RNA sequence: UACCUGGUUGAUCCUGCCAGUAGCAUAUGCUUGUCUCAAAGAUUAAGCCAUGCAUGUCUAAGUACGCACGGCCGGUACAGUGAAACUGCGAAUGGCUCAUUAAAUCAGUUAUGGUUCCUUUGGUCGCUCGCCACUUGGAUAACUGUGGUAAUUCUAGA
RNA sequence: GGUGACCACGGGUGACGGGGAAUCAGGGUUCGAUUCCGGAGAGGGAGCCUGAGAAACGGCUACCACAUCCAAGGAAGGCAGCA
RNA sequence: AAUGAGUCCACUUUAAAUCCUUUAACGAGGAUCCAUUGGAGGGCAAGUCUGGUGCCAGCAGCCGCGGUAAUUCCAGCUCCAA
RNA sequence: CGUCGCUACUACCGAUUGGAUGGUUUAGUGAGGCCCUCGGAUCGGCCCCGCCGGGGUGCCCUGGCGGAGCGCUG
RNA sequence: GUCUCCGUAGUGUAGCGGUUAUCACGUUCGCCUAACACGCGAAAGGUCCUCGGUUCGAAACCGGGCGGAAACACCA
């Protein structure tokens, strides 16, 4: 299989990031990161490919008062890709998914990180382009 | 040229039905190499690598996620002798009605039996399905079948002779009770995932010489499963009888409309001919006739054809109806029909009032006993007793039945495939019934 | 995708091709259509690379320079025959036209002569 | 065909509305023997469309060395039948719908002495003083051959 | 400067306009998407080549919304034409 | 005694058909070869008929009917208008 | 006749800097076409002219290789 | 087709592997009234959607099929 390597995190709790799908939401306010144990005073942060719990702050009204599982697909923080390549995107973006991993939406706007596509095949299936 | 048949593959869960069927399709010119390369690419993407050949028929997303067979699928592959379309049974007791529907539209049955340790014994149990599939195929009217043996590369040691001899003996010693002759039923050891003994004679298992069959109509002996698929005797097609179409599924294709797909039983279906449906009783006119991405000016019996009728919605006509010619005598709503249920395995007593699920041809509606007329012994319709209070396992009986949900049925004297039906209760098999009388409205 | 002279890149670009440029024939008059063409610079990322040798080398390539197939049909414009066979002024022009001989199994032998113009 | 009737009251005259009555024009219900005309996806969605067809075209009078046929009359540029293609024309007509549109479109009336106009028809085409004219130059089609792509009414080279 | 209670300007229209249709003492009152005339449009806008004549869409280009194939490198759309 | 609605020969028609008009031969005594849709208190033509239900079911555009002898409900017969 | 109490229906006010769906526009960004000013990947003519050539008689009517005039040009 | 929840006198529906009950009704009902109206009294009323398995026996412990109520997919 293959386990995702460590990358620069860059997106702590409280970061609001773009919505990259056709769900109707416009942004995702990260409230926590899945699989984070913790440390005193340390904010839980997430790179690309990480499942997060997010609440949409603006968008279609029947999504705003809920917590959704979400996956970060693009980030503005540079991260090393174990081949010497430092990659960063133009914006931080994520998609709305469920626990199993398939997206609530049906299409994705813009590229998706290679790590996120590898770790979530259902997101990669809807991916317009791979970065 | 060529003639048309239908084949169902039946067996135990996790034995690799869809995998072996799909790799048989691939060997017989099913689809090009790069599309199935993309299929294996997907299979490696999410994880189910060994489930790659299953995707050729298990196209549903729920099947593609759980790795569990759900729906009956069709795929066309041309063989050495004649055309054949294959039925892929689910193999689950939650989907037993789906298997019954699929096996109904099949002329031959393929009884794939696992040879690996554990799976074979788990198949042969009260919790098993190998008994269930064969018994209900014998109930629904499939005469000639084949028993296939799979997973010679999973057993220890692989490609064993004693293992296969035990398999054949243990299949025979109960399929004689079921009703299929091992002298006519061929026995093949195969392995779909490895791809041996299917298209070319095997080299990893030289101990297998070749199966032999001894039928009255024809004697055959081959080495590959194609050589056994092709030697299947051509069924007698009763084309003079009035047209009947036990419907499989309904589809709403954009641009052509709601096109039913159902097996032709009797008669000939043609473009430009008004047809009727028994359960929905709405008249409609056939526009065209096609099968398996190819067209037909005539539809022959035992064929999976897709014909476009005019001005009926997808919701109006649903799964399991009966269609026929409007000019000839039509199938009509049956208020009651006198059936001959032969009780096989029922713990409790069967009095008038208990409601099992009765499955005439395709669909599935629970029906209720009205009263039990006479007790009949196990063969020939020999009279024993009048009006028993209750029925018990090991006895045949003639019964008058009153279904609750509306349905149409036909007798075993006019359309023999329509006369075959089963009775199911307590999540097992409880009776074998045939229709010999029927009342219309 | 065929290559076009003058693109000055290695890679595929899209051009609104007009009448008589390259890599395009108009379906109707005045029609222009955007098409994908490959740059004029050649590199590894090619399937075929057309080459035309200019000057003759020291020896003969087998199957290439030998068995010189003739051009099928001769000149049709009268001045072109005049230039080909060095005609001064009206010297047996009717009989200097190339008579094409053709035959078949069922065909009785026959020559063919064009309708010379100008 | 310039028309009324029932309903407020114990009863009477009114005001007044409600209900009744008749036509057409959509839908629908019941029924249906013949025949002649004949509307028919406008009303909600100018919403979405698989598939097939709906725009092509040659006279004697533009260009034929396709054998794809063929008379040869046999010493001849081209008999002739005609594919394909170049060229010219049409494809801006027709058919469909009524979304937009409130001096806008449109209707009657007037003007272009404020403009253009393929084609048809009729004028004009020796009106000019100025080493091929017994006819000049080059290329491209169709055609042979070599291919690329998974493709397409895609095209490259020679 | 120009237009306005002789209703300008603005808004709504379940408005394409007319020839016309329905009702029929007279006067009127409703209806005209619909075969004739004129106009507009080709999913929504926009910009163009050819041609005497097009801002053409059973022509082209771009964006947008949908949407066909794929060997994932690409390619092709417009039934408010007859079905 | 006479006709068709239907079967159906041929013709006609028509691009070719179809239909209609002609024309052979069958085709009527419940001529069962069966006309229906709404009504019968008023307006508004037609029953103070019979049997049921009994302010229930229901009818009724509107006045109104129905709580055990219903001109109005449901049925049967008979009438009414087209 | 009106309050009050109960049951239904209809609108009304109403915090929520409520929400959704259309239309018209400010500003910013701005594909694409068209026009102009450049640009010159290529394709051609003349000066060809190292010359063998040449005819009225080195003084060429030019029939081809060939450099290239390393220019003028379309 | 996959997934989630709900369904129990006619309704309002508590519910416990040892008991489907009560209560507001709705109705009927002696009880009066010419008929009401209003007051006095009793009741009936449940396959726990439905059918199975576990269990000494289960509505309920578990699972199926049906109806509803939300999704999610579903293109010969
Ligand atoms: Mg702290
Ligand atoms: Mg000429
Ligand atoms: Mg009649
Ligand atoms: Mg309008
Ligand atoms: Mg109009
Ligand atoms: Mg018009
Ligand atoms: Mg237009
Ligand atoms: Mg012109
Ligand atoms: Mg346009
Ligand atoms: Mg009456």
Coordinates of N, CA, C and O (backbone and C1' of nucleotides) and ligand atoms in Angstrom, one line a residue, chain F residues 40-41 47 49-51 71-77, ligand 10:
Chain F
rA40 P -84.1 15.7 -9.9 O5' -85.6 15.6 -10.3 C5' -86.4 16.7 -10.8 C4' -87.8 16.2 -11.3 C3' -88.5 15.3 -10.3 O3' -89.2 16.0 -9.3 C1' -88.6 14.4 -12.5
rG41 P -88.7 15.9 -7.8 O5' -89.4 17.2 -7.1 C5' -90.8 17.4 -7.2 C4' -91.2 18.8 -6.8 C3' -90.6 19.9 -7.6 O3' -91.5 20.2 -8.7 C1' -90.2 20.4 -5.3
rG47 P -95.6 15.0 -14.0 O5' -95.1 15.0 -12.5 C5' -94.2 14.0 -12.0 C4' -95.0 12.9 -11.4 C3' -95.4 13.0 -10.0 O3' -96.7 12.4 -9.8 C1' -94.0 11.1 -10.3
rC49 P -96.6 9.7 -4.2 O5' -96.5 8.7 -5.4 C5' -97.7 8.0 -5.9 C4' -97.4 6.6 -6.3 C3' -96.6 5.8 -5.3 O3' -97.4 5.3 -4.3 C1' -95.6 5.5 -7.5
rU50 P -96.8 5.0 -2.8 O5' -95.9 3.7 -3.0 C5' -96.5 2.5 -3.5 C4' -95.4 1.4 -3.7 C3' -94.4 1.3 -2.6 O3' -94.9 0.5 -1.5 C1' -93.3 1.4 -4.6
rG51 P -94.4 0.9 0.0 O5' -92.9 0.2 0.1 C5' -92.7 -1.1 -0.2 C4' -91.3 -1.4 -0.4 C3' -90.4 -0.9 0.7 O3' -90.4 -1.7 1.9 C1' -89.4 -0.5 -1.4
rU71 P -92.3 13.5 0.8 O5' -92.5 13.6 -0.8 C5' -92.3 12.4 -1.6 C4' -92.3 12.7 -3.1 C3' -91.0 13.4 -3.6 O3' -89.9 12.4 -3.8 C1' -92.8 14.6 -4.4
rU72 P -88.6 12.4 -2.9 O5' -87.4 12.6 -3.9 C5' -87.4 13.8 -4.8 C4' -86.1 14.4 -4.8 C3' -85.1 13.9 -3.7 O3' -83.8 14.0 -4.2 C1' -85.5 16.2 -3.3
rC73 P -83.1 12.7 -4.8 O5' -82.2 12.1 -3.6 C5' -81.1 12.8 -3.1 C4' -80.3 12.0 -2.1 C3' -80.1 10.5 -2.5 O3' -79.0 10.4 -3.3 C1' -81.0 10.6 -0.3
rC74 P -79.1 9.6 -4.7 O5' -79.2 8.0 -4.3 C5' -78.2 7.5 -3.5 C4' -78.4 6.0 -3.2 C3' -78.9 5.3 -4.4 O3' -77.9 4.8 -5.2 C1' -80.3 4.8 -2.5
rA75 P -78.1 4.4 -6.8 O5' -78.9 3.0 -6.7 C5' -80.0 2.7 -7.5 C4' -80.8 1.6 -7.0 C3' -82.1 1.3 -7.8 O3' -81.8 0.4 -8.9 C1' -82.7 1.6 -5.6
rG76 P -82.1 0.8 -10.4 O5' -83.6 0.2 -10.6 C5' -83.8 -1.2 -10.4 C4' -85.3 -1.5 -10.2 C3' -86.2 -0.8 -11.2 O3' -86.3 -1.5 -12.4 C1' -87.1 -0.4 -9.1
rC77 P -86.3 -0.8 -13.8 O5' -87.9 -0.4 -14.0 C5' -88.9 -1.3 -14.0 C4' -90.2 -0.7 -13.8 C3' -90.6 0.4 -14.8 O3' -91.0 -0.1 -16.0 C1' -91.0 1.1 -12.6
Ligands
LIG10 MG1 -85.7 9.1 -7.3

